[PDB]
């Protein structure tokens, strides 16, 4: 039986390799988004190696002590989820997930030895990411939903309140959980035939089939990069196929100016490409066919439509004609991309993927226990492996430590604590208690961290 998962992390901050999560909670429901089961809720114990960002605490209430007495250590924590997310026919979603909670799972399968990317496609499982979902709706068929202005704001909780619909506790996961499947409804209700239309059209092979580069076939596409001034939509172009990464293709925005792609050179635009904030100038994007981006054949977007958002067709069609009677235009795109890091191991998932034979090793220390861990005699191929399972082992098994990885262990902590770091932790709480002084409950939470800092981070 094919199910959803939906899913959020409430973290201590907001870099999805750096910082650490607080809280995790998921639901599981069947097609229609009836509730099976019961919601699964959980913290996870902070190591003592860092410190959360103030900002964050502030936001969800929950401190590091909090965390460390009701949740588990990262190693337990990461079992629970690798179990729920690896249930057969599961589509696992969230609100933003793609762009961020996604990123913090791979992240904590990542450091605590469970494959990064498997969860997501093995056992027919997928993913899907109801923001763009609410984007698209907004633009295409706005129609039976309340949209929060001043220009369309697509936060959680705006969209909520702005529908009627319960949500209070914000920012605790089990709350935005039930906010999204309250959400998923509401859109299936009022907009059903552009729902399915943009669920069935998730998946790479459907996506595919919509994509035809030797034709540069039209297609509609939503993307946050466009702007809420377009409705974050417009018409796109699909180039080439990315030359070092076969799930990317090379879009130009048709309703752009593209002379850029024109008069310059691959150097300079690749220059002005790689530099620039991701805003849309040079009108192009690469589109992520395993990201579920929002793709639809060109007619969707209706005149009507178009006009409604100030997307001008014609215009749109000069620049086609005028790509197709250009090749050399789809030659100095393609080069543009013909050419594409830290030495802290927690930051190195992306560095390269881990061979058959490591992905094996790995698997072989997760069935051993913590406390054969150094006996332990595997051969491991990729150099990240050997530092990844000391964090591991300081962070969630301490007291299996030797004397002297006990030293090094403090040795690190006392890296991570510089002065410039604690004055600058010291200075941002000085200034937050300055301006939350009145407030009893927000107090409370800055006392606590200055409390956790000095147990953690002093002498
Ligand atoms: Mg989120």
Same mark, same amino acid.
């Given at each position: ?52 960002? %103030? ?55 990542? $450091? ?57 506790? =914000? ?58 001034? $377009? ?49 849309? =100038? ?10 579920? %981006? ?35 235009? $789809? ?42 861990? %150094? ?32 030293? $090094? ?9 510089? %002065? ?40």
């Amino acid at each position: 039986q094919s199910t959803f998962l939906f899913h959020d992390y409430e973290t201590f901050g907001t870099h999805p390799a750096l910082d650490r999560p607080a809280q995790f909670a998921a639901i599981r429901t069947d097609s229609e988004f009836n509730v099976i089961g019961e919601p699964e809720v959980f913290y996870c114990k902070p190591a003592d190696d860092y410190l959360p960002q %103030p900002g964050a605490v502030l936001i969800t209430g929950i401190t590091p002590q909090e965390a460390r007495a009701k949740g588990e250590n990262e190693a337990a924590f990461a079992a629970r989820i690798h179990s729920l997310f690896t249930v057969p026919k599961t589509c696992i979603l969230g609100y933003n997930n793609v762009r961020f909670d996604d990123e913090v799972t791979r992240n904590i399968f990542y $450091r605590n030895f469970y494959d990064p990317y498997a969860w997501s496609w093995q056992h027919d499982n997928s993913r899907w990411d109801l923001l763009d979902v609410m984007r698209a709706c907004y633009a295409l068929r706005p129609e039976g939903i309340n949209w929060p202005e001043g220009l369309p704001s697509f936060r959680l909780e705006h969209l909520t309140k702005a529908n009627g619909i319960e949500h209070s506790n =914000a920012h605790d996961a089990m709350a935005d959980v039930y906010a999204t499947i309250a959400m998923a409804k509401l859109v299936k209700t009022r907009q059903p035939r552009l729902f399915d239309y943009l669920f069935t059209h998730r998946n790479k092979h459907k996506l595919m089939a919509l994509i035809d580069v030797p034709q540069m076939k039209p297609l509609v596409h939503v993307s946050g990069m466009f702007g809420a001034w $377009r409705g974050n939509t417009s018409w796109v172009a699909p180039l080439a196929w990315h030359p070092e990464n076969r799930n990317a293709v090379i879009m130009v925005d048709l309703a752009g100016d593209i002379s850029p792609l024109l008069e310059l050179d691959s150097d300079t635009l690749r220059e002005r490409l790689y530099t620039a904030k991701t805003d849309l =100038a040079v009108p192009v994007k690469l589109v992520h066919i395993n990201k579920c %981006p929002v793709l639809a054949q060109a007619n969707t977007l209706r005149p009507e439509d178009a006009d409604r958002l100030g997307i001008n067709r014609q215009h749109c069609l000069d620049n086609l004609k005028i790509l197709r009677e250009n090749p050399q235009v $789809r030659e100095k795109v393609v080069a543009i991309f013909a050419e594409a890091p830290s030495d802290n191991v927690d930051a190195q998932l992306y560095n390269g993927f881990f061979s058959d034979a490591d992905r094996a090793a790995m698997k072989i220390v997760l069935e051993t226990e913590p406390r054969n861990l %150094p006996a332990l005699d595997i051969t491991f191929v990729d150099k990240r492996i050997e530092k990844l399972l000391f964090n591991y082992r300081a962070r969630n098994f301490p007291g299996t430590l030797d004397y002297a990885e006990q030293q $090094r262990w403090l040795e690190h902590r006392r890296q991570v604590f510089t %002065p410039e770091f604690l004055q600058g932790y010291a200075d941002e709480l000085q200034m937050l208690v300055q301006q939350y002084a009145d407030d009893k409950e927000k107090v409370a939470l800055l006392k606590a961290l200055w409390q956790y800092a000095d147990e953690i981070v002093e002498h």
